[PDB]
Design a protein around this nucleic acid. Structure first.
Ligand code: MG
Lengths: 102, 101
RNA sequence: ACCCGGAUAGCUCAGUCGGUAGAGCAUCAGACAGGAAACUGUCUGAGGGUCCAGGGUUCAAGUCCCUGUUCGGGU
């Protein structure tokens, strides 16, 4: 789902801006599982374009969505910046670079 | 109640194993205070034997004791390992080194 | 800008009188029933956290006080 060099990037990112907690492998695994429970092709995770399609498919449901959904949307955003080789240090930053594209 | 060199060790020990809080003087003071209310010589604190005597004297009362008592018993244990020059990094280790005997 | 409420296991959430934290799902391993078998079910165990960040009170803070960050809701 992620390359070798990308993992080392992934494992450097923090969940909260000032947090002392950062992403691990468990997040990717769990994300692919929850992707199927929502009737989505988990294969779309290993490409930057696949994530673009997923993120846009979930953008609307976010406003009315549950806390469990936003969490998923966030993890995919962070994972998108890694594929795009965009450098980010925490989830907030990832969401910002994704909104800058619009 | 404590020597100069022992203090430097005392104030390095952590209350909780991974805790970011460490022992200070207020703890030793507070322990001697609670000692007087129970009719015990606080002078027994500045000796390796004095703490050994207290710790064994309170072993029974522990099962039925208050939360504030456990606290006292622990603070005294740490104070014993410092007197004995036994190396400990937190209260937990002190309790372990006392049972290892 | 102001007021209110959240932040705790990979995720959603509980946590009582302050006294070092639990469940559900997820992940791993195992057991039992039916079945030659692939399999279809039922239960059990384990790992996994320092409780957003920084200070303060206290012998002792997830818990009480203040600040910052952040999310949602309201005016
Ligand atoms: Mg969470």
């Amino acid at each position: 789902v992620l390359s070798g060099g990308e993992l080392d990037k992934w494992e450097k990112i923090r969940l909260r801006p000032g947090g002392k907690k950062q992403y691990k492998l468990k997040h990717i695994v769990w994300a692919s599982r929850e992707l199927e429970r929502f009737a989505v092709n988990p294969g779309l995770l290993e490409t930057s374009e696949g994530c673009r399609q997923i993120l846009g498919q979930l953008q609307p449901s976010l406003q009315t969505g549950s806390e469990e959904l936003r969490s998923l949307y966030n993890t995919i955003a962070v994972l998108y910046c890694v594929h795009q080789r965009i450098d980010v240090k925490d989830t907030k930053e990832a969401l910002d670079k994704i909104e800058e594209e619009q």
